[PDB]
């Protein structure tokens, strides 16, 4: 399974000038393009080597499209300030995410197009790509507008068609990285908390994609108590890190096992002190 997603954030700046607009594009967990209204170029810019292959007509088109996106979000901020009866003095945020998933068969699986205002759900295209979830009465207005203008059908055409075609193109051109799994480099550390007890920490480093499961067992049985699972974090080189820890009685370290599941591992791994 693979995915292409674009993320858009616009922040209004009431003091002076137009909103801060940041757009980023991903294939799976790899960012491949960006636009920032505060950067010098005012172009869609590459963020992975495999997209740099694309010629001038790609970059001119994506720049044209991303700027049009920028203006839509500026106008949206104005529209929503009115709908919610807010003053011109406050800074507000619009967020939008859209894109497509393909399955193991490389065929269309799911499409998304959703929107938040000030970090709350506003409107979302539903899984059928034919109906809308409007969270409140402001969003219902947008829903009736979008249903009258047949926005869903236009989005469906992109999401089932063009979106998937771009994804397929990128997956091939970037296959060396995008279709390679990096299995986690695992090890365990030992931290003496007192004379009586110790913390075992199971590390998973340098893995891709980001999706991973770390679980502890005791004597072969799933243990939840006295564990601690950190949020998966980026290493900065395109891979990810995660750890899980368990506090144990000193001398009983051998009872406990860390279990690691990842797409890059044929069978799950087991570690033990």
């Amino acid at each position: 399974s693979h995915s292409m997603r674009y993320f858009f954030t616009s922040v209004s700046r009431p003091g002076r000038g137009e909103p801060r607009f940041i757009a980023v594009g991903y294939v799976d967990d790899t960012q491949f393009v960006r636009f920032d209204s505060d950067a010098a170029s005012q172009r869609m810019e590459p963020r992975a080597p495999w997209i740099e292959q694309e010629g001038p007509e790609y970059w001119d088109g994506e720049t044209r499209k991303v700027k049009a996106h920028s203006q839509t979000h500026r106008v949206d901020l104005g529209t929503l300030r009115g709908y919610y009866n807010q003053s011109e003095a406050g800074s507000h945020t619009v967020q939008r995410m859209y894109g497509c998933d393909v399955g193991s068969d490389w065929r269309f699986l799911r499409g998304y197009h959703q929107y938040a205002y000030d970090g709350k759900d506003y409107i979302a295209l539903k899984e059928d790509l034919r109906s809308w979830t409007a969270a409140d009465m402001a969003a219902q207005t947008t829903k009736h507008k979008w249903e009258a203008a047949h926005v869903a059908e236009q989005l469906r055409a992109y999401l089932e068609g063009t979106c998937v075609e771009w994804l397929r193109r990128y997956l091939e051109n970037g296959k060396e990285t995008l279709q390679r799994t990096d299995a986690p480099k695992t090890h365990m550390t030992h931290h003496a908390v007192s004379d009586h007890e110790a913390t075992l920490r199971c590390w998973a480093l340098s893995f891709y994609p980001a999706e991973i499961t770390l679980t502890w067992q005791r004597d072969g049985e799933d243990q939840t108590q006295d564990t601690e699972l950190v949020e998966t974090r980026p290493a900065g080189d395109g891979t990810f890190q995660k750890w899980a820890a368990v506090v144990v009685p000193s001398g009983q370290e051998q009872r406990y096992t860390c279990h690691v599941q990842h797409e890059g591992l044929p069978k799950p791994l087991t570690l033990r002190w």
């Binding site: 594009g25 507008k145 063009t162």
Partner: peptide
């Protein structure tokens, strides 16, 4: 590649 026409929330 981006959507050709983004819908505006106020039409």
């Amino acid at each position: 590649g981006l959507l050709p026409e983004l819908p505006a929330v106020g039409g």
